Structure formats: structure tokens, C-alpha cells
Amino acid sequence: GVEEIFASGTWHVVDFYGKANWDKRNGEPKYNAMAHNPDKTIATEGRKALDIIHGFNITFKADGTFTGSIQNGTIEGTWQADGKDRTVNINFTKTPPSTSYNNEFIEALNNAIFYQGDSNVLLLAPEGKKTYIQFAHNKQD
Numbered sequence: 533g534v535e536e537i538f539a540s541g542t543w544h545v546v547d548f549y550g551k552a553n554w555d556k557r558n559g560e561p562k563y564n565a566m567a568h569n570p571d572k573t574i575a576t577e578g579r580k581a582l583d584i585i586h587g588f589n590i591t592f593k594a595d596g597t598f599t600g601s602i603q604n605g606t607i608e609g610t611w612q613a614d615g616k617d618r619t620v621n622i623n624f625t626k627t628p629p630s631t632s633y634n635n636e637f638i639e640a641l642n643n644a645i646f647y648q649g650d651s652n653v654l655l656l657a658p659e660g661k662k663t664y665i666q667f668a669h670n671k672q673d
């Protein structure tokens with residue numbers, strides 16, 4: 533069931549993905565692309581963004597609660613998923629002092645309604661399926 537994917541250990545952010553083809557679990561990784569922009573100043577901003585978002589992680593518990601860590605502190609809340617249609621509903625009860633990257637992460641999780649994944653990855657997409665956030669069970673480095 534859903535606990536076998538969600539409650540499978542700490543999930544660490546890989547990237548935010550755009551131009552998604554949800555059917556095929558593919559898309560364009562935003563900050564890894566930014567770090568390879570041909571404008572060296574934009575590439576520098578992408579490298580800094582990667583170091584920040586790689587620190588973002590979340591742990592879902594089988595009791596329907598979660599905690600996680602982003603800039604300035606912890607997130608907390610509740611979650612439900614349905615394995616019959618691969619849908620999810622995340623609800624925040626605590627967020628730390630805001631930052632641009634925090635706001636992006638919190639919005640992605642708040643808008644998530646579909647999921648897919650496997651023993652390595654978790655992808656969460658909003659209703660339009662044009663974007664997703666991807667996690668892994670290891671911190672990116």
C-alpha cells in the first residue's frame with residue numbers, strides 16, 4: 533500500500549522538474565539546468581540553489597504525520613495517500629520562517645495530488661501534471 537512508498541525512509545530533494553511528461557516520469561530538472569546555463573552568473577546561482585535545496589528533506593510516518601527540514605527549521609503536518617489511484621494530500625501545520633526556496637518547496641508539496649515512484653525515487657505532481665518535485669533516499673551532493 534501507500535506506506536510502502538511514502539514511509540520508506542527519509543526523502544531528500546533531487547530537483548524541481550518542468551515541461552513534464554508525467555506518463556513517462558520525465559521532465560527538465562530546474563536547478564541542475566540552471567547550474568549549466570551558459571551565462572556564468574546564472575550558473576553560479578544554480579549551484580547555490582542546488583546546495584540549498586539538497587538540504588531539504590521530509591520523512592512520512594505510517595501514522596499519517598510527517599516532519600521535514602528546510603531553510604530555518606522544520607516543517608510538520610499530516611498526509612494521506614490512496615494507492616488505488618496514486619493520489620496524495622499533504623497538509624502543513626508548521627512551516628519555518630519563509631525564504632524563496634522554502635516557499636517553492638512548500639507550494640510544490642501543498643499542490644501535490646499525484647505520485648509515482650519506486651525504491652529509489654518519489655515524484656509528486658500537481659493536478660495539471662506539468663511539473664513535479666523528485667526525491668531520493670540519499671542526500672544529493
Ligand SMILES: [Ca+2]
Nearest residue numbers: 614616617619
Ligand atoms: Ca481515491
Ligand SMILES: [Ca+2]
Nearest residue numbers: 670671672673
Ligand atoms: Ca553527487
Ligand SMILES: [Ca+2]
Nearest residue numbers: 670671672673
Ligand atoms: Ca554522492
